[PDB]
Amino acid sequence: VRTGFFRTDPGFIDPEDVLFAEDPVRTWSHADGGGDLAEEVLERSNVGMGTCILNNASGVLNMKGLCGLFRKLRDLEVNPLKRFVVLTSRHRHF
């Protein structure tokens, strides 16, 4: 208590918590048509739901992204086996 550390002691770092840290972006790496993660909009194939990720390099939205997102959303909306849809971005700051 005088010099040693304790879990209750404020500032006690958990080594396992620090070690098991993960990069948030790496959660969508397996999402593409050709697998190069270059498409504007990336759709993941999941059971019972849809997942769409915006993957523009700068986070900007253009006609290519518009068309891709439109087609993906229409297909998912019409699909009854997909009970819900999720929309996210693969960028860092946007």
Next chain:
Amino acid sequence: CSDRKRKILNGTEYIRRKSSHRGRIKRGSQAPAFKR
């Protein structure tokens, strides 16, 4: 190899086959030896 090794084991080849390995009872080879 099944029937072939069976013949080897029962010794028909030991009698009827020439051997560049020679031996005092086996048939010998009078020609230069090569792998066949």
Next chain:
Amino acid sequence: MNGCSKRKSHRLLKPVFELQQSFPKIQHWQGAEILHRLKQKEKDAAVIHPCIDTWGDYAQCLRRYPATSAARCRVESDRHTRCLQQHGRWKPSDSLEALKLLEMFKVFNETARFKYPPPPVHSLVRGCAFPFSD
């Protein structure tokens, strides 16, 4: 003032019954034979009594020498005195064999004739039925 702020629980300060090194599992019968050799080499002193042999030797020496025993039987007398002083309050050991103690640690390897017992269920099962409604 300054001093240790945690319990001195180190297993060196408080030795515990454990094997600090693991080893690839050994065939049960081979391990049993090795342990038997070790026990024979140690000569586990489970004899009638440690003092019985000393007393027998002393009595035999006295019988052999009925006249000059006073001077002849002195090494035997000292040995018997030492044995009485050391193992006078001697009790035969009551402990499990090292073979069973190591089967507990699972050191050996299951062979055709040796299998570890399955986990107990009848003795360990504790059930508590309570109402859960409303």
Next chain:
Amino acid sequence: MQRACEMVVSLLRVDALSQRCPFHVLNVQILDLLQREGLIRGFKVDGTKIDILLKHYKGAPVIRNIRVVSKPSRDIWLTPHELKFRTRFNTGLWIMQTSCGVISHRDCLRMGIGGKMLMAINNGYQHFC
């Protein structure tokens, strides 16, 4: 062809979220077909390797079987009316390579083109060679 016959092993893994396989453009195209058919969650191209993120359902994997047809030591080709008979009464996916790309046996049957039979996915017990 060798790379595809190798990727069969990486696709047939169980109790795994993702598995790696050798890279090749043919592998990429077959993976595109599989994802369009909804048999894998996805895949990623990393240099010499491709990381396939597999899909599961109720514990078991979606891909329950892979039967290789065309090996690098033997091609297998079919006319449309032979492909129809060979794929009769089966919900499995028979991958076909044609002059129009790597497609499914159903696309090949509608197009009436001659194709090379590569793989059969979830085809149960249906093969001839």
Next chain:
Amino acid sequence: MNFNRIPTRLSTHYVCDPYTTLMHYRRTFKFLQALKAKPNCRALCLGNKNQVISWPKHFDGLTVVTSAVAAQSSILSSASVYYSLIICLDPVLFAKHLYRINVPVLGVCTPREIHEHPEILKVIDYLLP
């Protein structure tokens, strides 16, 4: 003090992480509330003598198999008549008996136990870390 192998790889536990535990609580709360909203329903609680004396060692569910020919028979076979929820604290010990049990099972166990015996997820229906 140690003379054994020193591992180099540590495995994470997603099943027993903070958010997964929160979701476990949220999902189990609804089932427990719905069960308690119905009357005359009893919940059995199973544990180990070393983790609970006062608790009775025999109940209605216990079958107490005594013959060798009955070794394969489960001991909790009849629990379904009396109970509508089995709260287990020793899934590793009771796995063979909770397998395909006809009542919902809420298991409490540690990440180490889950990882060392992942088959307990086939006998547990609800998990509370």
Next chain:
Amino acid sequence: PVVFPHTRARAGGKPIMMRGKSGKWHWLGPYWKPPWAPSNKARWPTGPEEWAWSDPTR
């Protein structure tokens, strides 16, 4: 650059010790590392001890 690794096939074969009472190596020696072997770092996790020589030149 993306280049595949080279084959792990090597000429000569594998170490063989001559049969009989000679003890001679028909090929290669006892320190030979097969191509299908883990890394040196994997096989020697501890690394050099504190009393080993930093420079191995004689």
Next chain:
Amino acid sequence: GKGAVHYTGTNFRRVQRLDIVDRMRALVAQGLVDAPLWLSAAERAPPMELSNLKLMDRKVHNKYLSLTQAVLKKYPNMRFQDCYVDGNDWSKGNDSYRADHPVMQFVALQLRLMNLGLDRHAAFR
């Protein structure tokens, strides 16, 4: 012939995991069991898919094995702390300390800074 030589084949079993709700729905539909009272509650609160979450556990390399060695080699006196507490094995060949040991705190802070994006030496300083 052989037995369990069919890797990627019949060695593994690709069978679905049927939880309580699935099994009970099947039993009720086929009429082998009378509808239990708890079944409605179980259906309205279906069990989660535990196998999918299990597949998410990933093995991680232990950078502490080397970070602890570095810090100990720089400051050997850290082994005195909590030397009498069970959990700190300071014998040669182990150097495995408790999470509350100064060595563990040091390496944890260093790895946290590295994750934040510093070099090993900068994090050490």
Next chain:
Amino acid sequence: KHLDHVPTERARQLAEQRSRVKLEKEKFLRDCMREQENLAALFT
């Protein structure tokens, strides 16, 4: 073969650098406590 072009993670990282922080999982202490309190209230 060393002059071929194939997408690579090194290439992606180089592009981003021309233009990765790991994060620790949150603990949700308050939410866990509230859920535990609700479960205890149910079991009262």
Next chain:
Amino acid sequence: APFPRGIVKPRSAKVRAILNLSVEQRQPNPLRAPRKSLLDPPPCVAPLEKGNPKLDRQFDTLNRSITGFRKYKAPHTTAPRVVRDRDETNFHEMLGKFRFDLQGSFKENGDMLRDSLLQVGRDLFLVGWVKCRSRFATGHIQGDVHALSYMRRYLEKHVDESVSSVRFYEENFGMPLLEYERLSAVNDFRAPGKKQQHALRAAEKNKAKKLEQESLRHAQELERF
């Protein structure tokens, strides 16, 4: 180290076990076979003890194992019918059977209870078998319905020993014939040497249990502290 001039390559499991450091089975390769699990079905092996099959869900004096020599079989097969037209004027002629288990404390290793039960059965003309020991008793009784009811009442209320629990099971009525012809007792006839060997084995098991019990009790004391 020594120089053997080569190594050996035995193929059999016996010689490999002799000539290798260990032949312990290793964990299955995740790329080849699945991991072993507690749910795996057990091997289909008949339980045997010293070569005899132990296949019986209940102990009974009429349990026998099939031997290698012919035993005379009944020349024909005829099952007497069950008389179901029984009224108050005839319900007393029906036969019956039951099994009983008693738990508690008895003295003289159950000799007193054995004698009492034998006397009661001799008076009531019951048949079957009984088995009494220091802490338990079991039996299978057959006879007239009234006699069975009297025996049940005697066992429940008229036993001169500590009877903590009584249980009756496998009750049947309306039987045409009786299996047994006398009420005998199952007496432990093991030799004293056999008893001593069994006691030594039991003591070994007890010591094994006591070690872990002491460890657990110390752990519980530390937790309490």
Next chain:
Amino acid sequence: MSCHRHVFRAAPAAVFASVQRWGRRNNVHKLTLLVQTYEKPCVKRTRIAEEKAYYPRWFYLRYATEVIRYSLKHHLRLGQALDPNDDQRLDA
């Protein structure tokens, strides 16, 4: 070489026992028996394989028996797995 022992303020039997221990730990009798008669190379291969497989097991079981004897002598109790997150704080 030849072991030399000085019998000074000790028993000749004790010194002879020490010499016997030296011989056993140096395998002198083993080598003498080996050289007294001809051993074919294959027999030597088998013997060396057997010894290399056997002796480590003996050493491990010797260590185990030493631990057992120490624990019995000192009345030590079986260990329980160290539960993590224990504060390990003094009750003072």
Next chain:
RNA sequence: AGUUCUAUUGUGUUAGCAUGGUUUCG
């Protein structure tokens, strides 16, 4: 993988030498 150099060689062929069982000589 291959070629060159680099540090290391219980690998294979090598003139001789130190030591040693055995036999030998007194």
Next chain:
RNA sequence: AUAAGAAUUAAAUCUUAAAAACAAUUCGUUAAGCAAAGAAGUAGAAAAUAAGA
């Protein structure tokens, strides 16, 4: 013949013998041909060979 040495389950063949140069034991000196006793964990990468009885 015989004893001793040697050997053997026990014996015998064999060597020496009467004061000893080489039967056997002890001590020196060369000589001859011959040459893995001593120094390396088939162990520790997760690294794993064959459905069952």
Next chain:
RNA sequence: UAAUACAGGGUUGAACUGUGGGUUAGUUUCAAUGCCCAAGGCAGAGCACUGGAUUGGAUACCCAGGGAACUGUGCUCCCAUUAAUAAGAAUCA
């Protein structure tokens, strides 16, 4: 398996190079002991054989002696023939 001489292979690094490979007969370098041939020829030990025992009996096991074989860029590859159950790619952190 000390030093020295002549050659490999393995490991590590730098450079070079740029699909240059995996498998392999109408292919041939090497390869225990024995046998044939040649060498030497009595350090040791040792087939056949001799004689000293055991055995109804042994042509053996035991003892004493022993001219076959025990070192070769030759003839040469029969085998329970040499680091294993052929070599290569893929799946794993």
